[PDB]
Design a protein around this ligand. Structure first.
Ligand SMILES: [Cl-]
Ligand SMILES: [Cl-]
Ligand SMILES: [Cl-]
Ligand SMILES: [Cl-]
Ligand SMILES: [Fe+2]
Ligand SMILES: [Fe+2]
Ligand SMILES: [Fe+2]
Ligand SMILES: [Fe+2]
Ligand SMILES: [Fe+2]
Ligand SMILES: [Fe+2]
Ligand SMILES: [Fe+2]
Ligand SMILES: [Fe+2]
Ligand SMILES: [Fe+2]
Ligand SMILES: [Fe+2]
Ligand SMILES: [Fe+2]
Ligand SMILES: [Fe+2]
Ligand SMILES: [Mg+2]
Ligand SMILES: [Mg+2]
Ligand SMILES: [Mg+2]
Ligand SMILES: [Mg+2]
Lengths: 160, 160, 161, 160, 160, 161, 161, 161, 161, 160, 160, 161
């Protein structure tokens, strides 16, 4: 009646520009998760425990985020690259330093790393939204969740 | 290496107008929560239990909503005010009456007050979206959820 | 002071007839997909039967939650859904699922095509829906995301090298 | 010792008459689930919520029932048909009407639809039991569960 | 279209004898529940805890059973009577004694009273099955469950 | 062993026969309420059936937990409960529940009355129980609170304002 | 029907206006504490933010459960609660919570004070409530116990030993 | 009045020796199937290994619950089960499962055959069991249903077009 | 700010040293009971071992929750608990638990006695505690109820009727 | 950098002697589970329930143990044999007797069967540890869990 | 048949020295549990909540540990003594002070007492392992868990 | 008497630099495996896609729990882990996972090889780790066990007859 008369109906394909934009998001989410864990292990000093715990919650969110983005790429037949060499070579996040770091330092360092990750998402959002609003909605959820983490972490160092 | 150089990368900040718009949403969500509980306790008459129970679901949603908005304000460096004096003085919701009220009256009263709350959100949504799409998505979820509540409550009084 | 409104009767958002019809289009294709998803679920046989059998139930679960979401969104906005069998069969845009057993390979291709068709319906109304009501467009986008994920998880069985 | 000495032992095969009898059950269970959802969405008026909720419980039972029957057919190497065209063309259930319907009307309509579904099962039960008691036990469980739903729904309109 | 024409399709109705048979089952299940709790509270002596706990499991099963039968009666348009006066006056179970009782005595007493309850169900099962096989299946589940309880309780007193 | 007691046999708190008798009064009315609640649960018909049907089970659940609590409190205090059908029928203060199907409106009034009777039994006994054993009065107070909540949740159906 | 009462209408325990008024005092302070707790929850900044942020939600959870408990206890006893914003603002005894971001140290002192004010309201009312209805006093005592625990868990942050 | 029975010793249902032997036949085949199911679970290799590996554990779970059910039903009816290794090996009707690794395709065929054999045993005693005790026949029918579902979920891997 | 208090510092309810001392008596006996319960849990042997082994853990669970409750109630009221081993040993009123394996019959009598001693400590203190702070007496009453239940569930093993 | 330059890297392979040592453990764990169930069904007399329940806990542990061992064999490319004929022919456990057995007898019989199973594990532990410490750790966990079960069961018959 | 002949097979028995070694571990675990609760209640000051909560986690682990050791003793026919008098008289842990203590002091005190407990376990581990490797594995789990607790607690006081 | 130690500062176990370096080797290979595991998880296509897709997430979960365990064990023993991307890429012994889509068959072989490499690292340090600290060796052995199980569950797809 209103049934389409075709046996091969094409799905929505992402352009390579689109795929590349999500690839930028992906590497930063992965880097953030790797840096978050480094901080989680090596944070020491006043209010260690809270930061130790909040950092795991950040890592959980970023890990779920990176899976979401990579699988959205695959859904649109783009192909993600989350390999270590690629992440190290292409991430926009400032390097996390080595060794034990005080809670105060870790708060400042991680807040910056989150903000860099959010910046990447905000930078590609318009171009992503223009091609596929559904992907932009996922990016928006990441912005929301990550900016929450930044507030929850940075507030420790806030003086009023 | 594509790593950024900055030691301190700042996060997205909301304009005063943006903060003010979310504050408007916040007071109406809190007011709806308080009126919802008032109705939950004081409703009597035909089909009491159904409305008693549904009103608790409305309250739960409005409370989660008010927390989400206030914490979105915090993330974007805005400062929420959810104090009783502020809510009473600035809420746009028509006052909920005191004392026992019939089920049919509660249905009409609460439907009106939900719709008032949705109106507030709908009226700020374009300006919010223009500045920050991620926050607009949160507002949209509230519109969806509250309008569902309105339908579930108001249907009790529907004619034919 | 007081910023309280005075009206005793404040009205809710009402969808236009066009908006309701657009969501109705989404509804029937979601239901048809659920019905076809189960048909495939029961009737698939062959290499890697179990994975597809299981994955198809996940598709049906998502499509069922989606149709309830759209139908209830219609109700919220004073529109009236029609999910009856006769209406679905008469108005769905999905090619009919064939009868009897189908090979795993064929089910993969068939169901992928039907998901693609269901998503195409949603993508085709999304602009018009977003223009009238952004909140509803968000629900549509959630459906697009979830369905296209199902399409990937199913179709990849047949993709080579 | 008592081990059977055959590498290919045949399972129990359903006759085509048996398969056709379960196919009759299947289409009615599916139709009932589709009608149940229609009622669930479009019911309005006094005691909306209870009926709204009970209708979802009916749909849940009928959906689980249809999966049970279709998979029992497959187990016995019959092949079910639950496609929309087939269901519409072969269901014995009276058509559910369009548009919003009052709770009182919905109670009466749905009770009849359940009773029709139960009738189909009761009508084939003897013939099914004669070939395969195990399938008849499943049919009996459906009779029990559906007749419970009919009582739970119809009681709303019962005047004593 | 194979759709039926009838606007009102009636459900299966039980005969008075059928209703009476299920009523017999109901009073004995309720009586067993009350006696089970009595035993649960008042048992003392060797292996108290095991019997204390097992008796609660018996009660749970009997209560679920009594609810199932009474609601099966309702579904088939019969009217259950589970009131205390009716149960006392019409139960076939030998009276459970008052006051503290040894574990060994409770084992013997409860086993006898379970067996009495099963006897009632077994005695009505053929007549129930003849009229409605689905109800007989429910009775069969009760026979299975209660006879399991009898074994689990009585084994405490077994000789060699 | 500085402050340790050297007693081989230390006995527990023993309830008086008056106290035992007072808990027995509460027990039979809780059991009778449970039986009447289920009777109402099964046989209630008419307007708003489902809500009442469901609420009546919640009442029965609470009454059943209460009877077990009181009975085992008796046992702990060396008293002996009697919850047998004959005893409950012969000694309950609750008005008899009628036979047959009863309308939702009638069931609301009937059950509210029987809850209030049960609560009255507990309230009339509470002073004497508290005077001997405050811990048991606390249990009684929990039952009062819970049952009076049930009464409100049931009776509100029939309210006209 | 040996001991059965023959009354058709048995009424429940009815709260006096004094009792109703006393529960209302508790209600508004519990609601005000809930609103102030959330304000603190959102706006607290500085040393040990997360612990306080989290503990403040636990406080709010308990205060919200308390207000519902008291309000519904009023309803059960035929009293009528008023938890509306205007009433709470106009009648609460709690000192006003300040606006803007506040340090963890200040929030600790502020919230401890407001908890103690809430507890004081309950303690000042408890004797009169107990005298009329011991069951309701038990509920009040639960609130005292829970809130005083919250006060300890919050104030200990600022302790210097 | 009173309809109470007078006997202090009321006996339970006793199974005939034939009935016990029939359930014993079911028992050993269920245990053998469980043992063979695990063997296949560990030793299957090849195309679609994981699905079959997983599905075989589901088969074993069902067969294990089934053997416990039948054995305990025997005990309830004063019969005595024998599930010892020697008895199982000496009396099972199932063809022995071969040793060492088997291909996925072979495991599908082998296990399907063994399920078919297990179900055949149950179907062969079902009439005689139902004649003596309908309640036990219902348990057998549950086993028939569950096992034949497992057979379908496993065998469909090898079914073509 | 109509009824709002303007006090910057509002202090909480402060326990007297007598009250603190009374809760300390309860604390050490609860801890001693916990340690003795575990000793019995490990070393009990003989007829009905498992039931007693299991019940003893339930006792210990309740006693441990009780000690934490009382200790934190002290903290809330500005009292300071001491649950250290030396203090518990030096100040407990419980008769010493013997060393080595002990029969189930002996463990029943031993543990019942030690529960009753613990309950006696609480009962002897309850009037004074209630007089100063009813909320804390409610906690004590919960402990009485729970421990006396444990005593019944344990001692019933050795009963001869 | 430190990346190994090989596309085919071999895993750790168990020797046939190792595989045979685990095969000895496997058959005894399986026999124990079969004997445990036999006891679970046929135990009667004083403290029936406790033993009935503890025997199921033993069977649960032994079943999980046998899966663990067989899957460890497979992991190291050994091939387990848990077939009935093999178990009966190669188990070191004394045969469990037929018919109903008293709780006292069942306690003694099962304790011995557990001790035999533990003996087998202890006997192969050194040889297993010498080739693969990770497998020896699994064996040690079985020793711990089984010896706990032996204590929990035997204590019933212990006279002091 | 490879079945063993013995009707009574004995289980592994521990030496007196072995029993004595586990007793040493037991008293220190119990002492750590009591001191942990003492600290949990009486800690005050900066970052109270984190330490309050972490100390409960330490207590939970130590209690599970003490139960595991005592029950391992029972399994191997040793007799644990966890009575208050014995613990006080034989524990190697430095006495925990009475009264309120600052967070920083509690961190230092508890770290020292955890380390004392670990020292006891480490000092008996070789002798335990030599006699029974399975018990040494249990000790190793305690070493792992407690040293994790030590790190999580002590990090609060770490300098840079 | 008293066996209590006197020191106010008792030190914990400190790992040697060699020991820390050995655990660092394990750490980077576990992280690399997690990263490669996800890459394969997203990019695998072909026959039996779904099973491998799912099984690879289970591998990643285990590898992630393992890296956190080793890193935290390092911290417990006063060693300092480095799990940063640059370090992992520069020091991992795993062959790099290739880019873009790979067939199911290829992913099976590739990932099996990488697990084998990860386990080889652990096996190579196990003796030295066990010599200094048996407790850490136990954690390594748990990793060996879990990873080799994953290798079997993955590799068996490609094993023939
Ligand atoms: Cl409801
Ligand atoms: Cl926390
Ligand atoms: Cl799967
Ligand atoms: Cl138990
Ligand atoms: Fe995933
Ligand atoms: Fe929050
Ligand atoms: Fe719904
Ligand atoms: Fe299914
Ligand atoms: Fe029910
Ligand atoms: Fe109980
Ligand atoms: Fe409520
Ligand atoms: Fe069992
Ligand atoms: Fe605590
Ligand atoms: Fe497994
Ligand atoms: Fe234990
Ligand atoms: Fe962690
Ligand atoms: Mg903190
Ligand atoms: Mg597969
Ligand atoms: Mg209703
Ligand atoms: Mg026992």
């Amino acid at each position: 009646s209103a049934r389409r008369t075709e046996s091969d109906i094409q799905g929505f394909h992402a352009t390579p520009e689109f795929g590349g934009n999500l690839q930028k998001v992906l590497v930063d989410l992965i880097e953030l998760s790797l840096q978050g864990k480094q901080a989680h292990w090596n944070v020491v000093g006043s209010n260690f425990r809270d930061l130790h715990l909040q950092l795991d919650e950040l890592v959980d969110f970023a890990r779920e985020g990176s899976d979401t983005i990579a699988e959205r790429m695959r859904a649109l037949d783009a192909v993600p690259d989350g390999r270590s060499d690629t992440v190290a070579a292409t991430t926009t996040l400032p390097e996390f330093p080595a060794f034990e770091r005080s809670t105060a330092d870790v708060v400042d360092l991680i807040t910056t790393r989150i903000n860099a990750t959010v910046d990447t998402i905000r930078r590609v959002d318009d171009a992503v939204d223009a091609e596929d609003p559904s992907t932009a909605d996922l990016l928006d959820g990441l912005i929301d969740g990550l900016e929450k983490q930044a507030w929850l972490i940075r507030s420790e160092n806030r003086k009023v």
